[PDB]
Amino acid sequence: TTALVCDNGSGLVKAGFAGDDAPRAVFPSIVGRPRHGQKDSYVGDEAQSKRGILTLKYPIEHGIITNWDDMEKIWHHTFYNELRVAPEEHPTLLTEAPLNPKANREKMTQIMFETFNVPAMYVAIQAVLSLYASGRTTGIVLDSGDGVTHNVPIYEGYALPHAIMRLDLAGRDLTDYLMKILTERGYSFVTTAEREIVRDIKEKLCYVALDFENEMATAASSSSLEKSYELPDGQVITIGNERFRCPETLFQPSFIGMESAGIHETTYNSIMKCDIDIRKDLYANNVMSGGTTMYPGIADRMQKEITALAPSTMKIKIIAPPERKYSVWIGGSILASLSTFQQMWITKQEYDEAGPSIVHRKC
Ligand SMILES: CO[C@H]1CC2=CC(=O)O[C@H](C2)[C@H](C)[C@@H](OC)C[C@H](OC)/C=C/[C@H](C)[C@@H](OC)C[C@@H](OC)/C=C/[C@H](C)[C@@H]([C@@H](C)[C@@H](OC)[C@@H](C)CCC(=O)[C@H](C)[C@@H](C/C=C/N(C)C=O)OC)OC(=O)/C=C/C=C(\C)C1
Ligand SMILES: Nc1ncnc2c1ncn2[C@@H]1O[C@H](COP(=O)(O)OP(=O)(O)OP(=O)(O)O)[C@@H](O)[C@H]1O
Ligand SMILES: [Ca+2]
Ligand SMILES: [Ca+2]
């Protein structure tokens, strides 16, 4: 009876056992079916590698599960293939997006008990789990993944739904933009294989400039910011100002034609929707989570930008844990293992005697 933790993301599923330091399984949130072994369906890395003979579907869009048949296949693959577990033997903690609809969390609960016959289950908000992994119960999380970005203020352990901000700009948009600007440089990154290559470039060589203009001027007048990158076939290319122009989009979404406030502004706006009494607690506990917060320099830039927006007397701290690609998962692991959490699981009996809407009371 070890609990399972499944963190379901737009781009990647992170899954494993409560008490482990990291998820054992990290794989793409993709289900593929034949166009014309062969097997009836494929999930994860195998679906991506065999994509030329498959139609791919992405059942989590901007953090929200939108296809239940495909999501069932993802969970089945997680349990049976990746973790090699019988879900009927393990309490299972799932994660969900901030502002996940009531009907959605009901269907998650239904499927876990009825399809997978789990003995117990819980559904927790991703950003809240990341805050827990940072060792606190009060703060404001910026969670940015492959498909969605949220600001989530949290007080005494619970998210404050009225102040949550959602922005449909995240890692996939940054990858697409890097493809575009490397192509404008004189290269050609346009195909699906080239998307995977550019994602690798983004993850290895991009960074957030402390000051965009200073960095552009450095790049214009020297080769000091230029890095080499070797493609799979051996050709070597040069990346220059694209390294920081790509993640700059988070702070200035207009670079890709979005009129949204940038991540510093949405952080400020979210704090200002909260009760005035807790705002200082939020400013002093800005926690970054998700893969799209991984850029070197992001914390210092956030500190600078929030300082410029906040009152002059305000103490501001940005916490950017090294583990933040997996901090939602870690939060789930430590929560599921915690003595005081054990009474909070929805049990199989509780489900049988209430149905899926028990999720609103217990979660
Ligand atoms: C080495 O592993 C760590 C890696 C890590 C990941 C990360 O993302 O962040 C870093 C660490 C982090 C920045 C860190 O870095 C070095 C610094 C952090 O600074 C304070 C230090 C953390 C220590 C690791 C931790 O030592 C155990 C310090 C400790 O200090 C006293 C903190 C303890 C917190 C009390 C504890 C809480 C938050 C955690 O408890 C396990 C929560 C799960 C409690 C949740 C809770 O009380 C809610 C409100 C209640 C009800 C549920 C409400 N829900 C679900 C609402 O939505 O749950 C029952 O928090 C912890 O015990 C946190 C433990 C974290 C780990 C074991 C992860
Ligand atoms: N070192 C890195 N630098 C920049 N981006 C990174 C880095 N590592 C991972 N990423 C990006 O992070 C994203 C994946 O992060 P994450 O697992 O948090 O998202 P997700 O949970 O799948 O999606 P979402 O939370 O949006 O639903 C991808 O876009 C990936 O390219
Ligand atoms: Ca996520
Ligand atoms: Ca703008």
UniProtKB/Swiss-Prot annotation:
Domain of life of the source:
Eukaryota
Signal peptide location? none
Name the predominant localization.
cytoplasm
Asked whether the UniProt record includes Cytoplasm among its keywords, one would answer yes
Q: Where is this region: Interaction with alpha-actinin?
A: 99-112, 347-359
Assigned EC number: 3.6.4.-
UniProt xrefs under InterPro entries: Actin, Actin/actin-like_CS, Actin_CS, ATPase_NBD
Provide the protein's localization.
Cytoplasm, Cytoskeleton
- Misc note: In vertebrates 3 main groups of actin isoforms, alpha, beta and gamma have been identified. The alpha actins are found in muscle tissues and are a major constituent of the contractile apparatus. The beta and gamma actins coexist in most cell types as components of the cytoskeleton and as mediators of internal cell motility.
Family as reported in the entry's similarity comment: Belongs to the actin family.
What the protein does?
Answer: Actins are highly conserved proteins that are involved in various types of cell motility and are ubiquitously expressed in all eukaryotic cells.
Q: This chain belongs to which protein, by name? A: Actin, alpha skeletal muscle
